Amino acid sequence: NPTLFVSYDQNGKKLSFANWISVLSPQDTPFVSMTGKESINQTIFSWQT
């Protein structure tokens, strides 16, 4: 039987979750982000020199 209702007897919360997630795992991929890409037809290929 409270008489003040101070931030503890307030039933029916919402939990005010956030709208994001922190994936702190390392995703740094400089080699891949620097090297280009090219669409190849078949699995095997070759290059002259």
């Binding site: 669409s39 190849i40 037809n41 699995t43 095997i44």
Partner: protein
């Protein structure tokens, strides 16, 4: 219908007691359907190239 081409003799002289007849019934044959199948597994590989 099995026409029963067998003719023979069924003669009667002047008033012979009409026999009970020799009617022939029909014969029914029947068939059934077969099921065919052609399977293919190979994917779209063999394109190692670009």
């Amino acid at each position: 219908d099995a026409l029963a081409s067998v003719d023979g003799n069924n003669a009667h002289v002047e008033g012979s007691r009409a026999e009970d007849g020799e009617m022939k019934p029909t014969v029914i044959k029947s068939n059934v359907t077969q099921i065919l199948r052609k399977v293919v597994r190979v994917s779209d590989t063999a394109n190692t190239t670009a």
